[PDB]
């Protein structure tokens, strides 16, 4: 009990410093301590009850700087602290957590599209590089299932991608998995039960509302119910057995809508609205603040 969905950063006209937290139990939203540096295209994750904001870019009227930052937020103090920075800036990054360690995957730095991957150790406040992916990927979706790390879709600098790959930590090795049915850049990617879900994204032409899921046992991607809204660069997380998607860009608007997927009924329902429309947010779940 007492866990909240946190949304950090994002983009609307410019990159944003907002930290806001939604309580699915009573519908409430809390505005919390701003990020020190506004960022979009960042990823959020949680280790040991601390919320981490990783990478992104600060888009401002007076410049656009890609971020190597790792900042950590303590709900007990409502304060952000700087952690050790990554080896390179990573805009439109994907992250995943295995066994208390944060993996930062891919992302862009200027015109460079990274294949490189690095691993953070909270107990040592240190980053170290691991094996790079087989494909350069920005706007990549990353999730962890059964202590394996998945990198799904993205953009390699020339083509948007339906391909996907799996990292095996004990061999420090990446291998291709079955590609998705759909090209998706900027999808929301998460894990629910034994499947990796890829929701929305941009296929090169239109923002998508389709959702597909990868069953690790069958190695197949299957479509599930589509979302109510087309969305790319959306926030995504899982909480009490349901997927929550937040925000994104639908082609026309920066969405404020939050939708919830129930796998048992295979339905999406609109559950709340963010305080303002935005895309490119980092999302993660941890205990209530204060």
Ligand X SMILES: O=C(O)C[C@H](c1ccc2c(c1)OCCO2)c1ccc2ccc(OCC(=O)NC3CCCCCC3)cc2c1
Residues that bind ligand X (CB under 6 A): 11, 40-41, 92, 139, 155, 160, 185-186, 202, 232-233, 249, 279-280
* Under 8 Å between Cβ of 257 and 273: yes
**What's the closest the beta carbon of residue 220 comes to ligand X, in angstroms?**
25
In whole angstroms, give the CA distance from residue 2 to residue 256. 24
End-to-end CA distance of the chain: 15
**What's the closest the beta carbon of residue 160 comes to ligand X, in angstroms?**
5
Q: Among residues 243 and 289, whose Cβ is nearest to ligand X?
A: 243
Q: Among residues 179 and 263, whose Cβ is nearest to ligand X?
A: 179
217 to 168, 169, 193, 201, 247: CA distances (angstroms): 16, 19, 12, 25, 31
Q: Among residues 26 and 158, whose Cβ is nearest to ligand X?
A: 158
Q: Which two tokens stand for residue 251?
A: 């082609």
Query: Looking at beta carbons, which residue is closest to ligand X?
Result: 280
Q: Which helix (H) or strand (E) holds 180?
A: none
Backbone angles phi, psi at 170, to 5 degrees: -75, -20
| DSSP for residue 90 | -
**What's the closest the beta carbon of residue 167 comes to ligand X, in angstroms?**
20
Q: Among residues 44 and 280, whose Cβ is nearest to ligand X?
A: 280
**What's the closest the beta carbon of residue 249 comes to ligand X, in angstroms?**
4
Q: Among residues 70 and 75, whose Cβ is nearest to ligand X?
A: 70
* Under 8 Å between Cβ of 132 and 119: no
**What's the closest the beta carbon of residue 13 comes to ligand X, in angstroms?**
10
């Amino acid at each position: 009990v007492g866990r909240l969905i946190y949304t950090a950063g994002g983009y609307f006209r410019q990159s944003l410093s907002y930290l806001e937290a939604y309580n699915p139990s009573n519908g409430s939203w809390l505005r919390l301590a701003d990020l020190q540096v506004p960022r979009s295209g960042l990823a959020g994750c949680v280790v040991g009850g601390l919320l981490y904001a990783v990478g992104g870019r600060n888009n401002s009227p007076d410049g656009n700087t890609d971020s190597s930052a790792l900042d950590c937020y303590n709900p007990m103090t409502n304060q952000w602290s700087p952690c050790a920075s990554m080896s390179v800036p990573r805009n439109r990054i994907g992250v995943g957590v295995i066994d208390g360690h944060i993996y930062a995957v891919g992302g862009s730095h200027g015109c460079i599209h990274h294949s490189s991957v690095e691993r953070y150790e909270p107990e040592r406040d240190e980053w170290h590089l691991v094996a790079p992916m087989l494909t350069r990927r920005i706007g990549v979706g990353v999730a962890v299932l059964n202590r394996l790390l998945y990198a799904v879709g993205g953009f390699d600098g020339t083509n948007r991608l339906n391909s996907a790959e799996c990292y095996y930590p004990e061999r420090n090795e990446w291998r291709m998995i079955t590609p998705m049915n759909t090209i998706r850049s900027g999808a929301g990617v998460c894990v629910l039960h034994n499947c990796i879900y890829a929701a929305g994204g941009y296929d090169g032409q239109d923002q998508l509302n389709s959702v597909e899921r990868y069953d690790v046992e069958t190695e197949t991607w299957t479509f599930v119910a589509p979302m109510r809204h087309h969305r790319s660069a959306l926030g995504i997380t899982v909480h009490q057995g349901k997927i929550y998607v937040l925000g994104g860009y639908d082609g026309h608007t920066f969405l404020d809508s939050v939708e919830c997927y129930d796998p048992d009924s295979d339905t999406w329902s609109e559950v709340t609205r963010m305080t303002s429309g935005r895309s490119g947010v980092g999302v993660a779940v941890t205990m209530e603040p204060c």
